[PDB]
Each structure stands twice: as structure tokens, then as C-alpha cells.
CSV table of C-alpha atoms in Angstrom, one decimal:
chain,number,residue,atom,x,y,z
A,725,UNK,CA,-9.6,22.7,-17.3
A,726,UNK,CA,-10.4,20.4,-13.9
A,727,UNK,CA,-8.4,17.9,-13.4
A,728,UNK,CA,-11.3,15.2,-14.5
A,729,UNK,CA,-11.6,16.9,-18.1
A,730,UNK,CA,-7.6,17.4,-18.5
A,731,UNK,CA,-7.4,13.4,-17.9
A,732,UNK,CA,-10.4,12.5,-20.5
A,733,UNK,CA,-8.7,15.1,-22.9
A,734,UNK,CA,-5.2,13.0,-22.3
A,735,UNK,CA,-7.0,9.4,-23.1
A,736,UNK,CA,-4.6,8.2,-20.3
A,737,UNK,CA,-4.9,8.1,-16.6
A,738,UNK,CA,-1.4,8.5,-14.9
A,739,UNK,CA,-1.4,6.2,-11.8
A,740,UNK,CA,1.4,6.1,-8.9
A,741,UNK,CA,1.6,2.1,-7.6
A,742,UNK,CA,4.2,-0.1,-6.1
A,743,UNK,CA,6.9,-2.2,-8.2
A,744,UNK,CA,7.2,-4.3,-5.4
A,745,UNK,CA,5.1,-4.6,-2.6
A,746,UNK,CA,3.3,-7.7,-3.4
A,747,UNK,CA,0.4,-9.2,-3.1
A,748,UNK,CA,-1.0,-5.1,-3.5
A,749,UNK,CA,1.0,-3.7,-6.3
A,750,UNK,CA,4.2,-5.8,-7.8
A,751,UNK,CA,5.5,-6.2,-11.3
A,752,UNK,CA,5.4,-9.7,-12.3
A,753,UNK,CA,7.8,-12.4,-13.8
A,754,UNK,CA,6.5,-11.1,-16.9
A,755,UNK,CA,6.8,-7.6,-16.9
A,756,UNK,CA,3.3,-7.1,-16.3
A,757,UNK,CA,2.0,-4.8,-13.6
A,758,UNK,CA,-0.3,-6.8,-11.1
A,759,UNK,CA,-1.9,-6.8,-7.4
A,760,UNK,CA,-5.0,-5.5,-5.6
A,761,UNK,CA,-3.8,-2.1,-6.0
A,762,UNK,CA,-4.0,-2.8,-9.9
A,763,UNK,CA,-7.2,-3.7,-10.1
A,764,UNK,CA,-8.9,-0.7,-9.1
A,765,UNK,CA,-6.5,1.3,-10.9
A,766,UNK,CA,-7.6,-1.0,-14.0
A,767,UNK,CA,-11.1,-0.8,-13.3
A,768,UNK,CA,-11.2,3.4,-13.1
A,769,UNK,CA,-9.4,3.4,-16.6
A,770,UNK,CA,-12.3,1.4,-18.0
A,771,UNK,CA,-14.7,3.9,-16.1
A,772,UNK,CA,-12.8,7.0,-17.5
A,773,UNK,CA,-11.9,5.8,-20.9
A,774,UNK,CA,-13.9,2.4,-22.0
A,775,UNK,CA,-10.3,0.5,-21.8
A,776,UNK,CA,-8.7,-0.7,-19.0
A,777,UNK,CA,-5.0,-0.5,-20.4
A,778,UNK,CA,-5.5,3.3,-21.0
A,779,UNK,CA,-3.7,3.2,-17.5
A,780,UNK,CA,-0.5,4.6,-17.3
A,781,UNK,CA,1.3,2.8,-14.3
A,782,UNK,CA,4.0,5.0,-12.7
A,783,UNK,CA,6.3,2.8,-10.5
A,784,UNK,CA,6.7,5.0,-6.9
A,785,UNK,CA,8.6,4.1,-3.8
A,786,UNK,CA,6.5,5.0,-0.1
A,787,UNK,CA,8.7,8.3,0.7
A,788,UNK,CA,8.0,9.8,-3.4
A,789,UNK,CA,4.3,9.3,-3.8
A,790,UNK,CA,3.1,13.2,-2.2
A,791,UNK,CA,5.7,14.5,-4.3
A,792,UNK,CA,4.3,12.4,-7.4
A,793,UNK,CA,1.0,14.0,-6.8
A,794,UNK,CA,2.9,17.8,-6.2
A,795,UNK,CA,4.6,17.4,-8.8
A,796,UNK,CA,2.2,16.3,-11.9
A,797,UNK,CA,3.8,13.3,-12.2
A,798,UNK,CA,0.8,11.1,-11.6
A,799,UNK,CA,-3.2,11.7,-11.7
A,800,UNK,CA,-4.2,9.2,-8.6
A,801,UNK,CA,-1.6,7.4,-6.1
A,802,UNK,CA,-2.8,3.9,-5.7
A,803,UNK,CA,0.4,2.6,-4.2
A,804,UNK,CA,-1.1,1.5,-1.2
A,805,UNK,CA,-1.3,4.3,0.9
A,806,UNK,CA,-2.7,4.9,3.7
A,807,UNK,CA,-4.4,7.5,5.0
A,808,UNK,CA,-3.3,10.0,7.7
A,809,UNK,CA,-4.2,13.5,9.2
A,810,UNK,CA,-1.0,14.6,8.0
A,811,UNK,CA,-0.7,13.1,4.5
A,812,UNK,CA,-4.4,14.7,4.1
A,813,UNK,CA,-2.9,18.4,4.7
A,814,UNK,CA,-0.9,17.5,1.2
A,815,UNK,CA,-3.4,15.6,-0.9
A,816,UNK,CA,-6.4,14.8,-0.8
A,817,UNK,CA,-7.7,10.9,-0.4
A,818,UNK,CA,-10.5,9.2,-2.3
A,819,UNK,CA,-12.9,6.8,-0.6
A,820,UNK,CA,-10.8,3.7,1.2
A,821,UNK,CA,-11.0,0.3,-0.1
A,822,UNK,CA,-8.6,-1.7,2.3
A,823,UNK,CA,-8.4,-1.7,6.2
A,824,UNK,CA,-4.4,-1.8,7.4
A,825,UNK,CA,-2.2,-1.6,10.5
A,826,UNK,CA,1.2,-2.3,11.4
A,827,UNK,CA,3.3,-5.5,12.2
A,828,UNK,CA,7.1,-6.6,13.2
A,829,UNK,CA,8.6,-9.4,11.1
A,830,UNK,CA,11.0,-11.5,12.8
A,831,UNK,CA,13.3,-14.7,12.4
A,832,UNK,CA,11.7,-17.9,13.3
A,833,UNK,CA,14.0,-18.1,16.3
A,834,UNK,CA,13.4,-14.8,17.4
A,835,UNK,CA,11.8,-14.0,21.0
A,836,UNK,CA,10.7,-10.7,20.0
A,837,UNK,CA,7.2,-10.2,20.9
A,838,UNK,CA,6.4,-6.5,21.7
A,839,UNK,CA,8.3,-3.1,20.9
A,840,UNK,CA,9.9,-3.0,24.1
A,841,UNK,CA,11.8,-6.3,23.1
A,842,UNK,CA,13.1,-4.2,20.2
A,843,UNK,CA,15.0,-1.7,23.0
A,844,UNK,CA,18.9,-2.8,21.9
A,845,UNK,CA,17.6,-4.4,18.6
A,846,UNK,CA,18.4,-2.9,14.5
A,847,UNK,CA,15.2,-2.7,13.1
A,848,UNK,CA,14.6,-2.3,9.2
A,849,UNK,CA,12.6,0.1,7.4
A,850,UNK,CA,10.8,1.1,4.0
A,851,UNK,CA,11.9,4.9,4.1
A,852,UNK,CA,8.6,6.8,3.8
A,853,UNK,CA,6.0,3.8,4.7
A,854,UNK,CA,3.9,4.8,8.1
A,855,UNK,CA,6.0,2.0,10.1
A,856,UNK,CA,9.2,4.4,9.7
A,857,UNK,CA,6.8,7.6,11.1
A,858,UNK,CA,5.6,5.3,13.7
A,859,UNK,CA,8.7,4.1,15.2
A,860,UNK,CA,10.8,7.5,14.2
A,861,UNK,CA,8.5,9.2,16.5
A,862,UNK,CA,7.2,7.2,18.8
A,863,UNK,CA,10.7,5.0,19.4
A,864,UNK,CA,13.6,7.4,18.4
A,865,UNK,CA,16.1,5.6,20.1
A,866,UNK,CA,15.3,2.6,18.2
A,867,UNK,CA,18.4,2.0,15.7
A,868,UNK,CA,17.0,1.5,12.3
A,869,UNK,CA,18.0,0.7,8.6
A,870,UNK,CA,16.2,2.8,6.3
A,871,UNK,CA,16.1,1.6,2.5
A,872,UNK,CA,13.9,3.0,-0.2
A,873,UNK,CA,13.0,-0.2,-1.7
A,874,UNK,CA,10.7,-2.9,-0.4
A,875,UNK,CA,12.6,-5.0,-2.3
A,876,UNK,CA,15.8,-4.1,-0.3
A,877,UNK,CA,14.6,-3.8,2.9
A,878,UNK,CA,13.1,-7.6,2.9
A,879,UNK,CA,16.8,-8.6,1.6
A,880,UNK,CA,18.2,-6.8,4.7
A,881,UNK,CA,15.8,-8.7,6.6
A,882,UNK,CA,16.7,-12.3,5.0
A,883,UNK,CA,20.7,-10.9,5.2
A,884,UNK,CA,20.1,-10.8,8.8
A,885,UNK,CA,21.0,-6.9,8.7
A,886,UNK,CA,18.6,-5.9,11.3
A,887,UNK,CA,16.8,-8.4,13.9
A,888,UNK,CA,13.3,-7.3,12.9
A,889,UNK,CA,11.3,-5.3,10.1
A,890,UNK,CA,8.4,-3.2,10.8
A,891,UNK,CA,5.7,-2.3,7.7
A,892,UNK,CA,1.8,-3.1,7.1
A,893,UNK,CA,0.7,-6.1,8.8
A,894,UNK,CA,-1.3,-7.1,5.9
A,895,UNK,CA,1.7,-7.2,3.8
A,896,UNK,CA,4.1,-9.0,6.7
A,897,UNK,CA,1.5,-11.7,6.5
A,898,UNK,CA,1.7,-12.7,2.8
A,899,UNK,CA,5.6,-12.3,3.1
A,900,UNK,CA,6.3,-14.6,6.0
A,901,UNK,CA,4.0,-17.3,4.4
A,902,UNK,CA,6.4,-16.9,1.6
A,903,UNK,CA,9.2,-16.4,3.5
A,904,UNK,CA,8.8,-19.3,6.3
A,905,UNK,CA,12.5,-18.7,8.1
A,906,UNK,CA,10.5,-15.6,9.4
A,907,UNK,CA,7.7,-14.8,11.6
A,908,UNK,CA,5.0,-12.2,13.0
A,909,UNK,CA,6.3,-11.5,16.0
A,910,UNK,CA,3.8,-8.4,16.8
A,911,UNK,CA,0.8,-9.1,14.4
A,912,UNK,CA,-0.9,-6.0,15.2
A,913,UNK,CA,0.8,-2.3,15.6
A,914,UNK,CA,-1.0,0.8,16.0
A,915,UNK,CA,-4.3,2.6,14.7
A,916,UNK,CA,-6.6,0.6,12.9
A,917,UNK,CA,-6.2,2.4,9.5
A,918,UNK,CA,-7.2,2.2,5.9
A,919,UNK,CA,-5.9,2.9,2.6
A,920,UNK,CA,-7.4,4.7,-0.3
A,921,UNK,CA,-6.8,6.1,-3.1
A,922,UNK,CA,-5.1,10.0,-3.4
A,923,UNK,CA,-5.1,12.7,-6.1
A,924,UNK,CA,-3.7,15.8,-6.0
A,925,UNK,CA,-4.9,18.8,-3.3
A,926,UNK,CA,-7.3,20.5,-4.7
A,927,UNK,CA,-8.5,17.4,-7.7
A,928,UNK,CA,-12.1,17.4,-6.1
A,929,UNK,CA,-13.6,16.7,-9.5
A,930,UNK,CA,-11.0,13.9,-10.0
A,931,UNK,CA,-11.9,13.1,-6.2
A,932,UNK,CA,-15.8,12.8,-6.5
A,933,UNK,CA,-15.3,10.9,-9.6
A,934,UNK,CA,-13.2,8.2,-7.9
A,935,UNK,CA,-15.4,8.2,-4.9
A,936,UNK,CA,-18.7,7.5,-7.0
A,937,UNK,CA,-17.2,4.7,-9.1
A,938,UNK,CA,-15.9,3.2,-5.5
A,939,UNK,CA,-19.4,3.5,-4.6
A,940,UNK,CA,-20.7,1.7,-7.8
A,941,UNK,CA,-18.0,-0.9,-7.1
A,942,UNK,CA,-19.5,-1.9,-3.3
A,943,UNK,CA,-22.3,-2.2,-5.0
A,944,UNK,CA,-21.3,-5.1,-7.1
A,945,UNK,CA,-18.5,-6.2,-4.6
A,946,UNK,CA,-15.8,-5.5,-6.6
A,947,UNK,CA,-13.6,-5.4,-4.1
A,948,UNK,CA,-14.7,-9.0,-2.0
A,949,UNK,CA,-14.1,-10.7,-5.8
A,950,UNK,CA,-10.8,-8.7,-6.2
A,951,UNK,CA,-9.8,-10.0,-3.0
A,952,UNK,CA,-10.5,-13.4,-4.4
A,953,UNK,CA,-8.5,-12.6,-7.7
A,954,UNK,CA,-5.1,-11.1,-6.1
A,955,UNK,CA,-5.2,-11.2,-2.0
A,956,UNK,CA,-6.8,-14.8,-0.6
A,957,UNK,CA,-4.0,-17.1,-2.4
A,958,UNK,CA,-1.7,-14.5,-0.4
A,959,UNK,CA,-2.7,-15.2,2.8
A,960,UNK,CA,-3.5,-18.1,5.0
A,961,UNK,CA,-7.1,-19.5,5.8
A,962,UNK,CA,-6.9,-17.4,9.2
A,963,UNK,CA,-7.6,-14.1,7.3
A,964,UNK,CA,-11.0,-12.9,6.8
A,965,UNK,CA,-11.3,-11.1,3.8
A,966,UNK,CA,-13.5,-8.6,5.6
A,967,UNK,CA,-10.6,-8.0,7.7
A,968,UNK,CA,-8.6,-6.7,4.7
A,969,UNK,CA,-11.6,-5.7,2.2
A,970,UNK,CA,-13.5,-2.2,2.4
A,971,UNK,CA,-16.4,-1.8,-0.1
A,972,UNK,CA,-17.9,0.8,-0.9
């Protein structure tokens, strides 16, 4: 069997997403699995199986979620991930739905304003997110705290462990308007990227499947109104949402 048929045989689509990276993919004061993130992985169930709680949600961390699709452990990764050259030598993405790039968080006090202010500065990390590639690589010299939660690595932040944390811009938005003893002190780091959806290496009718419902989405801009739903109350009335949004 494809992948596509093993997954209507289950009756259950297995889906990697975040515990705790919120406003994208968290677990609620209830229990409940909620965010962006969710919504598409909501909205395929209903495609696949008429139901959109015949989602399995796997709770992943950023360094585990390749190995969750090597592995079997989940049928799609929607933790959001973002897509690189090199991530797409291990799986294989699905059509992108949000647009993403890097920031530095920093105490309100701070004078931190560019990398090169970080020189002699402890920086925090998520271990596996594309802020720990970027800076691993591109600033090695850079001393860094690595911690596999998000969860963990904001506490570092708020302990005043490091002097700055580094992770998706979009995400170090709706966290300092939370957290207002903390600021953007870079608001925009690297590529411009996007994240989408990933299945396994080699899933291409899981793939084509998620791709033409993503499609079929734009069309009825299911991603503007999920935006709406789970992302705008997040940020602050200087976001566009079609600086976040992909549709289609």
C-alpha cells in the first residue's frame, strides 16, 4: 500500500505539532491541542476521513520531527517547520502555508540591535529550530544555551540565563507582546522563508494529496480566516496578515 491508502485504511491521520510554540501549535489550559498549525492539521482529517478529530496529534520538539517522519512515528509534520534545501534531502515538503524568518528577543533594557552586538553575549536556543543552524554556522563563536523545549528556552530567557534568544520572528513577535519586559531587538534575520507541511521521503501520494487540498483551501481562503481564528489576536495591529499568510 501507498502511504495515502495505508492512512484511509488506519481511519487516523498521525500528525507531528508543537506542545508549545504558541500562537502556531500549543496545548491549551485545557488540555486541548490548539494554534494555526492545528487547523490545517484539523481540516486534512476532515478531507481524509469526514471528521476532523480523526487526527492523531503527536507532540514533537524542533530537533525530533525528521526522525518522526524516518521513523513511522507520524504521517505529516505540521510543527511549524520550515523549509530548507537540506531538510528536503530527508523529507519531502507539502505546499507552504506561512511565510517565516528569523528574530533576536532581548530585555527591554537591552542595546542589542544587530548580530555583531551579540559578539561576548550567551544567546539561547531551541535545539533543532533553524535559529540554532543559523547561528551554529554562521556565528560559531557565539556562546549559546541549547534547550529542547520552547518552553525552557523562553524561561532561560525570563531567568536572565542568556542576554538574547534567537527563533522565528513570527513567533518572537506574539511572545514579547506577551512578555513586555522583552523586546525585538533584530526583527528580521535571514532568508525570507516559509513553512509547510512534511511527510515522509518518498509519501508522494500522501504529498499530492496535501498539496491539492492546500490548493482547495486558497481557494476559499482558509488560511486568511485561520489567521483570523488563531494568529491576529497574537500579534499587534503592525502585522499584515499577508505578511504571515500563504494561500494556496
Amino acid at each position: 500500500l501507498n502511504s495515502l491508502d495505508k492512512i484511509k485504511q488506519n481511519g487516523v491521520v498521525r500528525i507531528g505539532v508543537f506542545g508549545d510554540k504558541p500562537p502556531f501549535g500549543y496545548v491549551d489550559e485545557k488540555g486541548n491541542n490548539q494554534g494555526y498549525d492545528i487547523a490545517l492539521a484539523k481540516r486534512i482529517a476532515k478531507e481524509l476521513f469526514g471528521d476532523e478529530n480523526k487526527v492523531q496529534f503527536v507532540l514533537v520538539e524542533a530537533a525530533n520531527r525528521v526522525e518522526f517522519l524516518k521513523s513511522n512515528k507520524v504521517d505529516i509534520i505540521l510543527a511549524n517547520f520550515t523549509q530548507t534545501p537540506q531538510r528536503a534531502e530527508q523529507v519531502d515538503f507539502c505546499s507552504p502555508y506561512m511565510k517565516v524568518a528569523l528574530g533576536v528577543a532581548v530585555p527591554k533594557d537591552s542595546n542589542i540591535t544587530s548580530v555583531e552586538d551579540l559578539k561576548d553575549k550567551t544567546l539561547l536556543l531551541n535545539k533543532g529550530t533553524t535559529a540554532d543552524a543559523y547561528f551554529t554556522q554562521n556565528y560559531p563563536n557565539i556562546k549559546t544555551l541549547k534547550y529542547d523545549q520552547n518552553t525552557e528556552t523562553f524561561a532561560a530567557l525570563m531567568d536572565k540565563r542568556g542576554d538574547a534568544l534567537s527563533h522565528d520572528n513570527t513567533l518572537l513577535f506574539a511572545w514579547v507582546k506577551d512578555h513586555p519586559d522583552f523586546k525585538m531587538g533584530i526583527k528580521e534575520l535571514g532568508n525570507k522563508d516559509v513553512i509547510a507541511p512534511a511527510v515522509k521521503k518518498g509519501d508522494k501520494e500522501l504529498k499530492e494529496f496535501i498539496d491539492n487540498l492546500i490548493i482547495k483551501l486558497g481557494q476559499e481562503q482558509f488560511f486568511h480566516k485561520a489567521y483570523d481564528e488563531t494568529l491576529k489576536a497574537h500579534f499587534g495591529d503592525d502585522v499584515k496578515a499577508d505578511d504571515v499568510v500563504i494561500e494556496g
